[PDB]
Amino acid sequence: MKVRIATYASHSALQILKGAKDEGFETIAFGSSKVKPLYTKYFPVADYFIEEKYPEEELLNLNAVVVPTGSFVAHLGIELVENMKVPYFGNKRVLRWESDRNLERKWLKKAGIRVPEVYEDPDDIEKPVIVKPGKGYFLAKDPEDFWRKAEKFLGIKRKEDLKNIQIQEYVLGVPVYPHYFYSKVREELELMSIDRRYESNVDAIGRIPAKDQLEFDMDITYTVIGNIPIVLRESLLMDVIEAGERVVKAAEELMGGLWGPFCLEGVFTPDLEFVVFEISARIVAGTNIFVNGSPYTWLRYDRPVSTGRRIAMEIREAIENDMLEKVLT
Amino acid sequence: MKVRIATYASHSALQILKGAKDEGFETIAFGSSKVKPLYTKYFPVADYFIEEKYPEEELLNLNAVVVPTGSFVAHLGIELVENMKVPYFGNKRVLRWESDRNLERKWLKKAGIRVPEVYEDPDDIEKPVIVKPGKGYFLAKDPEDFWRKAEKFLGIKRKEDLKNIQIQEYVLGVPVYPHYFYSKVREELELMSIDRRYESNVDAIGRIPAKDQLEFDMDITYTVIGNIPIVLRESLLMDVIEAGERVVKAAEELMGGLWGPFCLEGVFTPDLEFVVFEISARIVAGTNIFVNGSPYTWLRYDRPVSTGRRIAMEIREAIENDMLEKVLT
Amino acid sequence: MKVRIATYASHSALQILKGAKDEGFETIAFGSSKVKPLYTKYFPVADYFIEEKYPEEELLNLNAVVVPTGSFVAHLGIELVENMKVPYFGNKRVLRWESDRNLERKWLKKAGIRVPEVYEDPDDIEKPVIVKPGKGYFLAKDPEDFWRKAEKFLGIKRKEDLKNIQIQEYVLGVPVYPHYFYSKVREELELMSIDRRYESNVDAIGRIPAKDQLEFDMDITYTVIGNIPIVLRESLLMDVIEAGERVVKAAEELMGGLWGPFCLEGVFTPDLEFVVFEISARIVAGTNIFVNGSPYTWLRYDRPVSTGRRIAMEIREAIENDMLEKVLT
Ligand SMILES: Nc1ncnc2c1ncn2[C@@H]1O[C@H](COP(=O)(O)O)[C@@H](O)[C@H]1O
Ligand SMILES: Nc1ncnc2c1ncn2[C@@H]1O[C@H](COP(=O)(O)O)[C@@H](O)[C@H]1O
Ligand SMILES: Nc1ncnc2c1ncn2[C@@H]1O[C@H](COP(=O)(O)O)[C@@H](O)[C@H]1O
Ligand SMILES: NC(=O)c1ncn([C@@H]2O[C@H](COP(=O)(O)O)[C@@H](O)[C@H]2O)c1N
Ligand SMILES: NC(=O)c1ncn([C@@H]2O[C@H](COP(=O)(O)O)[C@@H](O)[C@H]2O)c1N
Ligand SMILES: NC(=O)c1ncn([C@@H]2O[C@H](COP(=O)(O)O)[C@@H](O)[C@H]2O)c1N
Ligand SMILES: [Cl-]
Ligand SMILES: [Cl-]
Ligand SMILES: [Cl-]
Ligand code: NA
Ligand code: NA
Ligand code: NA
């Protein structure tokens, strides 16, 4: 291949570049010098390592296509990405739509996705809510409970003094993260895998007896540490997949389309509702478990297919059918 | 093959029909029209999809053998299954023995399986118990504690007024679900895999600080959402396997035998006791993780073997050795 | 091969002996007669089974090399192992350094590994601590809190009466167990896999509502039941791997080297710190999940590589390059 596959040296670069190698591409990682050994020695998946944040000129010279990851908004910034001259796998317009809370809400509403109800006025609370002044977060049962806690925790003594808070329907369920891939080449959605994200200290507090917890003011945090593989109850799959289809269709109207990997981040309630908190409109690191395929890909492929490999398969096929320009922005 | 493998379109049908395809069988799914795309498009494992609850005549015409799942008792009912004219993989007599609490208890007792002690009289309580009036469930330390709580939660003011409750030894341990397969063709038990079931809201409450929990009357639910793969400590395997052997042997006496997949559903205590709450005498959906084999099957096979594939292997071999009638009822 | 691979019949023997078979070795398990069927029938990985605790003479006659596991210190004892005449895969000097709390502390300090701060004097407490009189364990905020609890729980009324306790910095994080392998043949460290150990009753208490917990004096236990596969956030890998490198380098100075499998047992904090509680300087049973390779080995191998197989690969290669004596003590 003339085209090389490149990505930032973090997040899911190991999986992405291995998938690229499996499909016959030469690979490029770019990032911190500290992590060069990870990608060239411990897991030798990068044919080139460039010790720079975003080496645009070198990437152009190497005929690179960049695969975006969660490290893109986090480490390079939306404006840098939107202005990049290196071909980008996916639609870079999606970045604003997934990052802006209001645009994301508009997207999910158009896609008919179940999300927590937002309350603009605390006096409209009729079911338990989570108040977001993940730090300082607390629950409120009703308006009366809210105002007592607004006084106790936030020092609010008058209703006109309440400012810059989020009030949201509290939705209790188990975290579930389905990983999708939409092929623009084949015009087809796939379920790639599913994971349960592993977070600290939130996933550690369950090991602490209530009695010991109550002696302290608990400071619950949601730092992402890793990922645990799961499968869903089979009868839940159709609605999870239909949700993915609706998200893609909505994006076709709103932002010029969505293709490649994405994830809907949410919880499953005891009433079997998938309620979505966030959309990640690119590869998520939960896919890293599935370098050797997943319980889902092995239902439909004769070989191991990670999301990383699936990306490289899409690029290769696009090249094979003279439509590479269709999958790049 | 003349014989085709069929199952209801839910529970573990993806795994079952993929396993059938891997072994050279043509496949049939039957169920709700809503889920047809799951089995024909997103994961194309069904050669035929019949949009009916139980299309007996069509299944007979297609020379189907039906593989039972948890969706059978749940969605078709024991009487329908017992009367079905389509050949059934396994012993359909087991359905009553696994579903009737007293027959199940008799089975497990005969099989020398550790189960929670049942208390008929609350005044006989000498160790902590769980009271089942999973809703309304509460613990009691002793008879005095029980009667106070029976008054508080159930309104029982006189001992003669207590009616229709379950009182059971409370057993604290981590949920463990070993998946077995007994080959009637080979007269051999295998351990196929092990999972930890993922349930809502019960597996979500550990993420909630005690302080926040105590502000509400908690309503703990055990809705099944999915499955997480596990392995056991190696020194625990022999007793887990011996338990499986005893279950099979007991069934040979009581109900005309048990063969094919099954699962013992329970917990492991800190004293390394496997205590069983339920038997599922057919494929369990925890096996869905292991489409590409499991940490256990890869110890003894040179290829990926799911429980679904193992079922198809048994059927094929039965056909090969002219003993298909032995594995069907 | 003339050399046969042997191990005690527990812990990770299934994985070890399967890995040995995959690499062309004949295999020996030795242990309890009760477990013979596990290794010869249910998972036929042992060519020879010797029904003895440590059959030295028979093992010498069979040209065995022994692969150590966690069952070695637990079931045979350090003195027996140090005196064994059968060739031992790894450095048997490491056993004291990993088992003696003070030697282990010295090792980890030399290796620049983050560990909980130890407090010799309770009056020096300035951050929350765990007190270890895992039974009887409690937390203390400060010296005043400690002495109140020392009186309440331990009956200590005078400061001079306090004896034989451990006081340690309390570190809240999610359990993480990276599995390493250092090849002496190749002079190279690998990350083999990562798991989250599954423990009872500690991992069951999160399913119990705070209200129900508080009615009882909780007795939290940490009995190991099994293992759950995980991957880490990719940006955390370099420091995890560097920690492994430092451990190996430190051992080269202190104890004549470390090679073969090992594990650093700890937690990841919300501030992305890996804090280590223990080192296990041999194969850990968390590797048992990865009989068919791991999300990490499949990044760098074209075939399934468990830690068990990796051990056999090292032995075979040592033989191939006439340096077997270098990997044995
Ligand atoms: N509406 C909600 N209901 C229940 N849990 C929530 C809600 N919003 C956020 N959370 C939880 O709190 C964490 C931090 O929230 P955020 O800061 O909004 O990402 C999330 O990862 C969720 O687990
Ligand atoms: N005897 C028992 N001891 C401890 N936990 C139990 C017991 N019986 C049931 N449970 C738990 O409560 C849940 C619901 O119980 P059941 O409604 O009997 O299936 C089960 O899935 C178990 O996790
Ligand atoms: N310094 C510490 N901070 C937090 N948790 C700890 C600490 N030391 C031990 N633990 C936990 O308590 C369990 C039993 O401790 P030990 O008896 O020291 O192995 C460990 O497996 C850890 O999960
Ligand atoms: N563990 C699972 O994923 C699971 N999936 C289904 N089941 C059982 O089978 C019954 C039918 O499932 P479904 O309602 O998804 O068709 C359910 O009520 C449940 O008891 C399970 N235990
Ligand atoms: N993680 C595991 O599955 C595990 N299995 C065994 N072990 C360790 O090895 C020792 C011996 O195990 P066994 O008692 O199953 O032979 C145990 O006391 C324990 O410290 C483990 N950590
Ligand atoms: N689930 C994961 O392992 C994960 N890894 C990374 N991320 C997201 O990507 C962002 C960048 O990750 P990193 O800081 O490791 O480069 C993080 O802030 C986080 O939002 C994840 N969700
Ligand atoms: Cl992510
Ligand atoms: Cl089931
Ligand atoms: Cl171990
Ligand atoms: Na988003
Ligand atoms: Na049952
Ligand atoms: Na140690």
Side-chain angles (χ1 to χ4, degrees):
Chain A
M1 246 92 179
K2 187 191 182 176
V3 160
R4 296 188 174 90
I5 290 174
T7 198
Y8 185 82
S10 194
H11 191 269
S12 53
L14 292 171
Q15 180 202 167
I16 289 164
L17 299 183
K18 178 57 162 63
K21 281 186 153 293
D22 291 350
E23 291 297 315
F25 291 90
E26 290 187 359
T27 53
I28 306 151
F30 58 93
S32 174
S33 63
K34 194 179 185 293
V35 301
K36 185 178 175 184
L38 187 64
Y39 301 94
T40 59
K41 186 203 183 299
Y42 298 106
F43 304 99
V45 295
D47 295 321
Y48 305 89
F49 196 98
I50 308 164
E51 292 175 349
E52 295 171 35
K53 172 187 168 175
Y54 171 57
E56 179 165 275
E57 271 205 295
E58 290 174 61
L59 289 168
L60 289 172
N61 186 236
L62 287 160
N63 301 314
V65 160
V66 77
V67 178
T69 64
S71 293
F72 275 54
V73 174
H75 298 286
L76 275 63
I78 289 174
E79 210 57 71
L80 186 157
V81 183
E82 287 182 336
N83 300 148
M84 75 195 293
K85 289 179 160 61
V86 180
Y88 174 107
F89 177 80
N91 181 7
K92 51 196 199 179
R93 266 188 86 186
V94 181
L95 298 174
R96 294 199 181 276
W97 283 90
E98 69 166 318
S99 302
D100 186 296
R101 191 185 297 148
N102 294 316
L103 294 176
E104 184 179 42
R105 183 175 295 111
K106 177 178 171 64
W107 190 354
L108 293 163
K109 184 179 177 173
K110 181 159 184 68
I113 303 300
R114 170 74 162 103
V115 299
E117 186 178 356
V118 173
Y119 293 86
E120 300 297 322
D121 190 349
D123 295 326
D124 290 329
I125 298 162
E126 76 274 312
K127 62 169 84 75
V129 292
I130 184 164
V131 184
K132 304 180 182 178
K135 100 98 60 64
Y137 288 20
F138 64 91
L139 305 181
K141 303 188 178 198
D142 51 50
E144 292 74 40
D145 193 38
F146 173 90
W147 291 113
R148 288 195 295 271
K149 289 173 176 168
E151 189 174 6
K152 186 175 167 65
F153 305 126
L154 306 171
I156 305 299
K157 290 192 175 186
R158 311 181 307 172
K159 290 194 178 182
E160 63 261 45
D161 294 337
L162 191 74
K163 65 159 287 299
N164 286 6
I165 79 294
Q166 294 182 64
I167 304 159
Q168 223 173 58
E169 170 191 11
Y170 170 71
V171 179
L172 179 57
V174 296
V176 172
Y177 305 77
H179 316 140
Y180 305 88
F181 186 93
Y182 188 77
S183 173
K184 190 163 181 190
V185 172
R186 292 176 181 245
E187 300 282 4
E188 176 178 43
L189 183 76
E190 285 177 70
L191 179 65
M192 294 308 294
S193 50
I194 313 172
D195 91 290
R196 189 212 182 276
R197 204 163 66 196
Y198 193 34
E199 299 159 333
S200 185
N201 63 17
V202 62
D203 287 324
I205 68 155
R207 290 167 63 97
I208 311 164
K211 190 174 178 64
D212 298 320
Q213 288 193 31
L214 293 166
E215 297 193 346
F216 292 88
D217 278 320
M218 302 293 293
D219 173 49
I220 307 310
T221 39
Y222 299 86
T223 306
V224 186
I225 298 307
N227 308 270
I228 301 158
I230 71 168
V231 295
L232 282 173
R233 180 173 177 173
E234 185 172 292
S235 63
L236 302 176
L237 295 175
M238 200 62 262
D239 284 332
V240 162
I241 292 167
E242 282 183 23
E245 294 282 12
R246 292 196 303 275
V247 167
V248 170
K249 185 66 182 167
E252 272 153 25
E253 335 293 314
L254 293 168
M255 66 197 77
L258 169 67
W259 63 91
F262 63 100
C263 171
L264 293 173
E265 307 185 2
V267 294
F268 259 98
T269 70
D271 294 318
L272 300 168
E273 268 196 298
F274 185 44
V275 181
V276 175
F277 296 149
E278 280 182 56
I279 179 158
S280 293
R282 30 76 193 167
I283 188 171
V284 298
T287 61
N288 289 329
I289 310 159
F290 306 106
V291 171
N292 200 40
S294 82
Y296 297 103
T297 59
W298 283 107
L299 289 169
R300 63 173 282 162
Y301 297 95
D302 65 352
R303 65 199 175 281
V305 182
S306 64
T307 290
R309 194 178 184 176
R310 189 66 191 84
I311 291 158
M313 288 161 62
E314 177 84 349
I315 296 168
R316 166 176 58 77
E317 281 192 347
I319 291 162
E320 287 173 355
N321 293 292
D322 205 20
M323 57 179 294
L324 183 59
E325 69 292 332
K326 280 194 65 176
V327 296
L328 307 177
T329 55
Chain B
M1 246 92 179
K2 187 191 182 176
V3 160
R4 296 188 174 90
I5 290 174
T7 198
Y8 185 82
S10 194
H11 191 269
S12 53
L14 292 171
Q15 180 202 167
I16 289 164
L17 299 183
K18 178 57 162 63
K21 281 186 153 293
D22 291 350
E23 291 297 315
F25 291 90
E26 290 187 359
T27 53
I28 306 151
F30 58 93
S32 174
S33 63
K34 194 179 185 293
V35 301
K36 185 178 175 184
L38 187 64
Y39 301 94
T40 59
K41 186 203 183 299
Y42 298 106
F43 304 99
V45 295
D47 295 321
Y48 305 89
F49 196 98
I50 308 164
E51 292 175 349
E52 295 171 35
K53 172 187 168 175
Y54 171 57
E56 179 165 275
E57 271 205 295
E58 290 174 61
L59 289 168
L60 289 172
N61 186 236
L62 287 160
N63 301 314
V65 160
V66 77
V67 178
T69 64
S71 293
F72 275 54
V73 174
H75 298 286
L76 275 63
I78 289 174
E79 210 57 71
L80 186 157
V81 183
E82 287 182 336
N83 300 148
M84 75 195 293
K85 289 179 160 61
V86 180
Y88 174 107
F89 177 80
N91 181 7
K92 51 196 199 179
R93 266 188 86 186
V94 181
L95 298 174
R96 294 199 181 276
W97 283 90
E98 69 166 318
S99 302
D100 186 296
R101 191 185 297 148
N102 294 316
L103 294 176
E104 184 179 42
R105 183 175 295 111
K106 177 178 171 64
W107 190 354
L108 293 163
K109 184 179 177 173
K110 181 159 184 68
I113 303 300
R114 170 74 162 103
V115 299
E117 186 178 356
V118 173
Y119 293 86
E120 300 297 322
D121 190 349
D123 295 326
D124 290 329
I125 298 162
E126 76 274 312
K127 62 169 84 75
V129 292
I130 184 164
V131 184
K132 304 180 182 178
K135 100 98 60 64
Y137 288 20
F138 64 91
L139 305 181
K141 303 188 178 198
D142 51 50
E144 292 74 40
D145 193 38
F146 173 90
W147 291 113
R148 288 195 295 271
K149 289 173 176 168
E151 189 174 6
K152 186 175 167 65
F153 305 126
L154 306 171
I156 305 299
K157 290 192 175 186
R158 311 181 307 172
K159 290 194 178 182
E160 63 261 45
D161 294 337
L162 191 74
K163 65 159 287 299
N164 286 6
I165 79 294
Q166 294 182 64
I167 304 159
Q168 223 173 58
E169 170 191 11
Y170 170 71
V171 179
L172 179 57
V174 296
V176 172
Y177 305 77
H179 316 140
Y180 305 88
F181 186 93
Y182 188 77
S183 173
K184 190 163 181 190
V185 172
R186 292 176 181 245
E187 300 282 4
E188 176 178 43
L189 183 76
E190 285 177 70
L191 179 65
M192 294 308 294
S193 50
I194 313 172
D195 91 290
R196 189 212 182 276
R197 204 163 66 196
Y198 193 34
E199 299 159 333
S200 185
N201 63 17
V202 62
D203 287 324
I205 68 155
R207 290 167 63 97
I208 311 164
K211 190 174 178 64
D212 298 320
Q213 288 193 31
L214 293 166
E215 297 193 346
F216 292 88
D217 278 320
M218 302 293 293
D219 173 49
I220 307 310
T221 39
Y222 299 86
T223 306
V224 186
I225 298 307
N227 308 270
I228 301 158
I230 71 168
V231 295
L232 282 173
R233 180 173 177 173
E234 185 172 292
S235 63
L236 302 176
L237 295 175
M238 200 62 262
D239 284 332
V240 162
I241 292 167
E242 282 183 23
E245 294 282 12
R246 292 196 303 275
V247 167
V248 170
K249 185 66 182 167
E252 272 153 25
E253 335 293 314
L254 293 168
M255 66 197 77
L258 169 67
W259 63 91
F262 63 100
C263 171
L264 293 173
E265 307 185 2
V267 294
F268 259 98
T269 70
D271 294 318
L272 300 168
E273 268 196 298
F274 185 44
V275 181
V276 175
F277 296 149
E278 280 182 56
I279 179 158
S280 293
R282 30 76 193 167
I283 188 171
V284 298
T287 61
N288 289 329
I289 310 159
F290 306 106
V291 171
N292 200 40
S294 82
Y296 297 103
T297 59
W298 283 107
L299 289 169
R300 63 173 282 162
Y301 297 95
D302 65 352
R303 65 199 175 281
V305 182
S306 64
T307 290
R309 194 178 184 176
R310 189 66 191 84
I311 291 158
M313 288 161 62
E314 177 84 349
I315 296 169
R316 166 176 58 77
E317 281 192 347
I319 291 162
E320 287 173 355
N321 293 292
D322 205 20
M323 57 179 294
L324 183 59
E325 69 292 332
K326 280 194 65 176
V327 296
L328 307 177
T329 55
Chain C
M1 246 92 179
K2 187 190 182 176
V3 160
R4 296 188 174 90
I5 290 174
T7 198
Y8 185 82
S10 194
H11 191 269
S12 53
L14 292 171
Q15 180 202 167
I16 289 164
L17 299 183
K18 178 57 162 63
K21 281 186 153 293
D22 291 350
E23 291 297 315
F25 291 90
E26 290 187 359
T27 53
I28 306 151
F30 58 93
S32 174
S33 63
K34 194 179 185 293
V35 301
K36 185 178 175 184
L38 187 64
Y39 301 94
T40 59
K41 186 203 183 299
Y42 298 106
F43 304 99
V45 295
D47 295 321
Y48 305 89
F49 196 98
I50 308 164
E51 292 175 349
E52 295 171 35
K53 172 187 168 175
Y54 171 57
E56 179 165 275
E57 271 205 295
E58 290 174 61
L59 289 168
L60 289 172
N61 186 236
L62 287 160
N63 301 314
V65 160
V66 77
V67 178
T69 64
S71 293
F72 275 54
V73 174
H75 298 286
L76 275 63
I78 289 174
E79 210 57 71
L80 186 157
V81 183
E82 287 182 336
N83 300 148
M84 75 195 293
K85 289 179 160 61
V86 180
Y88 174 107
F89 177 80
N91 181 7
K92 51 196 199 179
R93 266 188 86 186
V94 181
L95 298 174
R96 294 199 181 276
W97 283 90
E98 69 166 318
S99 302
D100 186 296
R101 191 185 297 148
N102 294 316
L103 294 176
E104 184 179 42
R105 183 175 295 111
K106 177 178 171 64
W107 190 354
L108 293 163
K109 184 179 177 173
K110 181 159 184 68
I113 303 300
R114 170 74 162 103
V115 299
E117 186 178 356
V118 173
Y119 293 86
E120 300 297 322
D121 190 349
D123 295 326
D124 290 329
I125 298 162
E126 76 274 312
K127 62 169 84 75
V129 292
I130 184 164
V131 184
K132 304 180 182 178
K135 100 98 60 64
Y137 288 20
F138 64 91
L139 305 181
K141 303 188 178 198
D142 51 50
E144 292 74 40
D145 193 38
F146 173 90
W147 291 113
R148 288 195 295 271
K149 289 173 176 168
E151 189 174 6
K152 186 175 167 65
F153 305 126
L154 306 171
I156 305 299
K157 290 192 175 186
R158 311 181 307 172
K159 290 194 178 182
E160 63 261 45
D161 294 337
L162 191 74
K163 65 159 287 299
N164 286 6
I165 79 294
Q166 294 182 64
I167 304 159
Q168 223 173 58
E169 170 191 11
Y170 170 71
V171 179
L172 179 57
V174 296
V176 172
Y177 305 77
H179 316 140
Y180 305 88
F181 186 93
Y182 188 77
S183 173
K184 190 163 181 190
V185 172
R186 292 176 181 245
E187 300 282 4
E188 176 178 43
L189 183 76
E190 285 177 70
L191 179 65
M192 294 308 294
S193 50
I194 313 172
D195 91 290
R196 189 212 182 276
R197 204 163 66 196
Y198 193 34
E199 299 159 333
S200 185
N201 63 17
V202 62
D203 287 324
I205 68 155
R207 290 167 63 97
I208 311 164
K211 190 174 178 64
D212 298 321
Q213 288 193 31
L214 293 166
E215 297 193 346
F216 292 88
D217 278 320
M218 302 293 293
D219 173 49
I220 307 310
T221 39
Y222 299 86
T223 306
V224 186
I225 298 307
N227 308 270
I228 301 158
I230 71 168
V231 295
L232 282 173
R233 180 173 177 173
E234 185 172 292
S235 63
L236 302 176
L237 295 175
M238 200 62 262
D239 284 332
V240 162
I241 292 167
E242 282 183 23
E245 294 282 12
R246 292 196 303 275
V247 167
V248 170
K249 185 66 182 167
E252 272 153 25
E253 335 293 314
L254 293 168
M255 66 197 77
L258 169 67
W259 63 91
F262 63 100
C263 171
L264 293 173
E265 307 185 2
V267 294
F268 259 98
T269 70
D271 294 318
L272 300 168
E273 268 196 298
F274 185 44
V275 181
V276 175
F277 296 149
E278 280 182 56
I279 179 158
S280 293
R282 30 76 193 167
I283 188 171
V284 298
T287 61
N288 289 329
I289 310 159
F290 306 106
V291 171
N292 200 40
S294 82
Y296 297 103
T297 59
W298 283 107
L299 289 169
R300 63 173 282 162
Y301 297 95
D302 65 352
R303 65 199 175 281
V305 182
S306 64
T307 290
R309 194 178 184 176
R310 189 66 191 84
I311 291 158
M313 288 161 62
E314 177 84 349
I315 296 169
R316 166 176 58 77
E317 281 192 347
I319 291 162
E320 287 173 355
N321 293 292
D322 205 20
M323 57 179 294
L324 183 59
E325 69 292 332
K326 280 194 65 176
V327 296
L328 307 177
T329 55

